[PDB]
């Protein structure tokens, strides 16, 4: 049925990795997320839409000769987090936020083996730099910046340049999402490159774009 999984490279030891689901009322969709290297070290942020697509980027990775060092996912949906039982199973270590966590918990799904709590958290000997903007997307989005590269992850938070609107907004927060956008605005002026969680990878105006978008959904309802 569906296509599989793509994995490009954007910057040095940085790849894209784009995995498909078919999701009723939204047709077929794909899902960003990244690969990340340090020292010979990959690690993934946010995991494939599937099972069988998480397994595919890990053994890119163990074909390419990285050391796998974990996964972090960005929040609770399943465009980010199907692979956390896989890698669990793999004692491949998997994070995300311990509010996350509680919302894999309460709907009855696996969860991350490691947590944290806080705004701010690092990961790979601080080669990646994990912040919590507020509400936009979901009330638990978090965003991951790549310093040595000026190399933002948005996730879902972030839209791409070419949509109009905020995508699916069953649960976010989008009185509080202008807010959350501005604090990222204001925290990463100088990115180079920002990664959406769904769509097209540009640049800092990815941000400035999503801040519009969510102003005008706040306003507008
Ligand atoms: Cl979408
Ligand atoms: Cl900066
Ligand atoms: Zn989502
Ligand atoms: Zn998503
Ligand atoms: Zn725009």
């Known amino acids: 049925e569906i296509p599989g999984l793509e994995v490009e490279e954007i910057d040095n030891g940085v790849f894209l990795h784009k995995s498909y689901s078919r999701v009723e009322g939204w047709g077929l969709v794909s899902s960003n997320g990244l690969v990340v290297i340090s020292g010979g070290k990959a690690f993934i942020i946010d995991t494939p839409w599937s099972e069988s697509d998480t397994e595919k980027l890990v053994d890119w990775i163990r074909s390419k ?92 938070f972030i839209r791409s340049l070419e949509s109009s609107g905020l995508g699916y907004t069953g649960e976010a927060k989008i009185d509080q999402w202008p807010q959350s956008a501005r604090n990222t605005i204001s925290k990463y002026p100088e990115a180079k490159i920002v990664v959406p969680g769904h769509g097209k990878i540009g640049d800092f105006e990815l941000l400035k774009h999503t801040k519009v978008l969510a102003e005008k959904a706040s306003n507008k309802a």
């Open 65 to 156: 000769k990285y050391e796998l060092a974990g996964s972090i996912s960005t929040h609770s949906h399943e465009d980010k987090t199907a692979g956390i039982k896989w890698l669990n199973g793999k004692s491949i270590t998997t994070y995300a936020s311990a509010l996350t966590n509680e919302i894999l918990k309460r709907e009855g799904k696996e969860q991350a083996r490691s947590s944290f709590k806080g705004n701010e958290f690092s990961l790979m000997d601080g080669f990646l730099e994990v912040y919590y903007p507020g509400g936009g997307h979901t009330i638990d989005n978090l965003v991951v910046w790549i310093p040595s590269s000026k190399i933002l992850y948005g996730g879902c």
